[PDB]
Write an enzyme that holds these catalytic residues in place. Structure first.
Site: not given
Ligand SMILES: CC(C)(COP(=O)(O)OP(=O)(O)OC[C@H]1O[C@@H](n2cnc3c(N)ncnc32)[C@H](O)[C@@H]1O)[C@@H](O)C(=O)NCCC(=O)NCCS
Ligand SMILES: CC(C)(COP(=O)(O)OP(=O)(O)OC[C@H]1O[C@@H](n2cnc3c(N)ncnc32)[C@H](O)[C@@H]1O)[C@@H](O)C(=O)NCCC(=O)NCCS
Ligand SMILES: CC(C)(COP(=O)(O)OP(=O)(O)OC[C@H]1O[C@@H](n2cnc3c(N)ncnc32)[C@H](O)[C@@H]1O)[C@@H](O)C(=O)NCCC(=O)NCCS
Ligand SMILES: CC(C)(COP(=O)(O)OP(=O)(O)OC[C@H]1O[C@@H](n2cnc3c(N)ncnc32)[C@H](O)[C@@H]1O)[C@@H](O)C(=O)NCCC(=O)NCCS
Ligand SMILES: CC(C)(COP(=O)(O)OP(=O)(O)OC[C@H]1O[C@@H](n2cnc3c(N)ncnc32)[C@H](O)[C@@H]1O)[C@@H](O)C(=O)NCCC(=O)NCCS
Ligand SMILES: CC(C)(COP(=O)(O)OP(=O)(O)OC[C@H]1O[C@@H](n2cnc3c(N)ncnc32)[C@H](O)[C@@H]1O)[C@@H](O)C(=O)NCCC(=O)NCCS
Lengths: 155, 155, 155, 155, 154, 155
Positions: E18, E42, E91, E129
């Site tokens: 991140h 989640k 990733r 994560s």
């Molecule tokens: C929380 C949201 C943004 C999705 O998040 P997600 O589960 O991907 O979060 P996560 O904490 O896993 O990752 C955060 C970001 O960093 C990226 N990432 C994770 N690990 C890594 C890594 N090692 N390297 C690079 N990027 C990474 C993920 O791809 C994402 O871009 C989505 O659920 C959301 O918008 N929720 C709010 C309600 C909403 O509007 N939902 C309708 C969506 S259409």
């Protein structure tokens, strides 16, 4: 089972990722054959003799590895060496389903013959041969990608 | 609908996987056209004539199956046969996103034309033409992967 | 094969993509049964009764489409309907290998039973129930993604 | 990072999906360089001259876009332009592991260089140049797939 | 377009991957909002407030970054921030198709709202994560996978 | 590396695919530890103690196999056994990138630790525990999918 392993590939050219697979599989098998396939149908950048030579150079430090070139079917090769294990490397851009398909096909050609998979080091997990070739071919420097001892051959 | 479907491929050679798809799709349509594309852009191991002849033999006993060779767009072929369904086989090494893309490119070309997928038997889900050709080109025996009627031809 | 297919799903809620597949597949079988599974092990946002009513409303105008809820194994349901065809929809986030795995798992339970796949229109091929639930749960407007008949109920 | 991005590609021919990426990525950088690679290894349908011209024509009305042809390494190209951003477009049939691989290969050649990805409009997320080429090879009509101003150069 | 970007996620917990995304994308945008979603469904290991503090702490050295917690739809947040670009990270274990699908869904909920993707450094491209949480829960050391200053928080 | 391997899993319940992997990797190391993880976060249908007992029963005839249940980190477990190799099986529905990720995460926690991958028989390459659980939960017969030994202990 551990008597002999075959690690077969095109190795065009040998890279750091291939070396990590040879480094670890050679621990498991008493003898590791690195079988360099002709693969004329792919259209290798380097010839069979050049590819054999590079990979012999890059694998001198492994005392139980022997490199050979071969033109026939891998499954029959294994049968010649009395080998019951093919070694493959798995990395990021590995076509995983194609690996499984080829493992079953080799077993259908030789009922004794298993396929086992290793991983390279994480730094080398994104190295492919076709990037190296692309770098060479546009005259760039790929020496951080392939063993230093083959560099003067591919330069 | 129901009255005709077309299962198009390069069939180079036809395998037991493609036969599985013919067997199953031939149950759903009054008539199934098995259409062997020229596909000169791949570089098939067997000529158009050889590939038509082989799939004709291997399909002799399917009453409602008719094999044809064609040179142009599959979308136009369908139109010619008043056909609004293309048949495809999905298997383990399928490029599934490419299948979707081809289905929407085909509908693009002929707005009435849908794509429908079948599966082969589990035993034949790992068979691909390229592995079969790799075997045949390296002198291996591929008779367990293709119908018995064609073995005199591909050998 | 031609007379009945079952399109089974959780339908939580039904979406424009699910309607696409009903539309398409109902053209290919004399009768299409849309079977809403309990699927209590997922944790459906909407109740079984609500998911059935929803899909009943949105399918009211298709002549040969009948909707039912069910609790047990889909392979047994097909057997009860003298049905040898399961219908699935293939879309962009489809887990394609899991589809094959389910198809063969279904056949292992009912040896007659084949799985056949349809595609939705391209505009709807990115729609998923999961995203529709996430929208609806976070107070957003999902009406562009599901049939208008049901919107009164999901809000 | 804010001043310049390079969108590199073989562009064989430029399609509506490429244009989307150009439109999108031109909105994120003060200058966008559309760089047409020789790519002689992919054996393009259209020569480098023709592909440059077609992209020039199709991009003529974007105020901050210039197109160039190049024969060398993209990572040295970015050096020349004091650019640390490579732009790529992500679509349904993108081979995603290989995009990551290429981004780290580009970065292993020029250490300040990042790869940023944009998406096309949804309707165009299924267009590939491979399919355009197949269409026009088979003298079909691919005019719905590529910008109006290049159509006559490809008929 | 460069005015403000939003980088949304669950961040349970924030990891080195991140921070790579934050490091690069905060170069492109004059302000980067890191938006910590509640993500109830989640069942996060860490509470919303704890996740917000860890990431605020891990990002203090980035002078144009601000972290916020939110409970609503991301496309609506972007609207209140006048933001036209969601930032995502890509990733090795990324569900690529699900990224494309959610990009289009956010576009369909807010017509001006694009999605742009960055990559972490290669060493961090294999960090997830969920692997971190696994390690934490079976009581091992994950300090090599997350910024060390947040370690005592976790 | 040649002396011992640990094949860790949730085994919920043990299926014919896991037995294949146990048969195969047990031919490659002088001892094999089949390690049943608590996995309380998954939500196992069967308790640790049932899944230990079923796997013991199903492996009682492999002479060089020991089954154990463990609550802590696998990488520490491997340490405590003086073991350098984790065994994983690869099948059709494997999440391949997540395997490689877990291999590198395990090696982060214990720097000598390698992960090696075996394939099951082709017939069991579509078997997953989740589908067995689903059949059992819906009172169907999953005795074609798991060893006879454990079948009484499942229904
Ligand atoms: C929380 C949201 C943004 C999705 O998040 P997600 O589960 O991907 O979060 P996560 O904490 O896993 O990752 C955060 C970001 O960093 C990226 N990432 C994770 N690990 C890594 C890594 N090692 N390297 C690079 N990027 C990474 C993920 O791809 C994402 O871009 C989505 O659920 C959301 O918008 N929720 C709010 C309600 C909403 O509007 N939902 C309708 C969506 S259409
Ligand atoms: C040549 C064969 C072995 C295919 O090899 P392939 O083209 O994959 O060779 P390549 O040089 O690309 O790779 C070598 C090996 O290292 C692996 N690998 C490649 N790069 C990396 C890396 N960075 N890290 C780890 N492993 C790697 C590959 O997965 C493979 O295991 C196959 O074509 C063959 O067996 N040909 C002989 C004729 C035959 O019997 N064919 C019938 C097969 S059923
Ligand atoms: C030839 C066409 C159909 C592509 O065929 P393909 O190369 O997929 O042929 P191939 O012989 O490999 O496969 C034939 C069919 O069997 C399926 N299949 C292959 N092996 C197996 C197997 N073991 N089991 C089940 N199905 C299988 C394939 O998925 C396909 O559905 C296509 O290129 C085409 O339409 N060409 C004509 C020109 C044209 O119109 N192109 C425009 C496309 S937009
Ligand atoms: C409920 C079943 C069929 C699985 O359904 P699934 O969860 O995929 O339902 P879902 O509502 O997500 O989708 C319904 C169908 O529409 C497809 N689909 C979903 N969205 C789209 C879209 N946008 N476009 C096209 N198709 C779509 C799905 O791929 C599926 O084909 C399955 O779990 C089942 O059979 N349950 C009964 C118990 C049983 O027999 N299980 C044993 C399985 S071996
Ligand atoms: C030419 C390069 C950039 C590869 O380009 P590619 O083959 O992907 O070009 P192509 O024309 O197919 O695509 C152009 C760009 O548009 C994207 N794209 C293609 N179709 C679509 C679509 N429908 N929608 C959105 N994006 C699309 C591609 O993903 C790519 O980002 C690469 O080969 C290169 O850099 N060559 C120069 C030499 C070099 O430095 N090579 C070594 C690389 S380490
Ligand atoms: C428990 C572990 C090993 C993950 O196990 P998993 O959930 O994959 O177990 P599962 O029972 O599904 O499968 C067991 C093994 O058999 C393989 N497998 C399953 N079905 C099949 C089949 N049909 N054919 C071949 N192989 C198969 C799986 O790929 C896996 O290798 C992992 O969670 C773990 O190590 N837990 C301990 C805590 C720890 O150290 N975790 C941090 C890890 S970084």
């Amino acid at each position: 089972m551990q008597k002999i392993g075959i690690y077969a590939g095109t190795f065009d050219p040998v890279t750091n990722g291939h070396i990590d697979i040879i480094h670890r599989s050679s621990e498991l098998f008493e003898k590791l054959i690195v079988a360099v396939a002709h693969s004329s149908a792919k259209n290798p950048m380097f010839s069979l003799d050049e590819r054999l030579k590079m990979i012999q150079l890059a694998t001198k430090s492994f005392k139980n590895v022997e490199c050979v070139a071969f033109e026939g079917l891998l499954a029959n090769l294994a049968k010649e060496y009395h080998c019951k294990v093919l070694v493959r490397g798995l990395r990021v851009v590995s076509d995983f389903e194609y690996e499984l398909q080829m493992g079953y096909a080799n077993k259908s050609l030789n009922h004794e013959l298993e396929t086992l998979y290793f991983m390279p080091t994480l730094q080398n997990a994104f190295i492919s041969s076709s990037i190296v070739r692309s770098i060479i071919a546009h005259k760039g420097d790929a020496s951080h990608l392939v063993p230093k001892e083959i560099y003067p051959l591919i330069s």
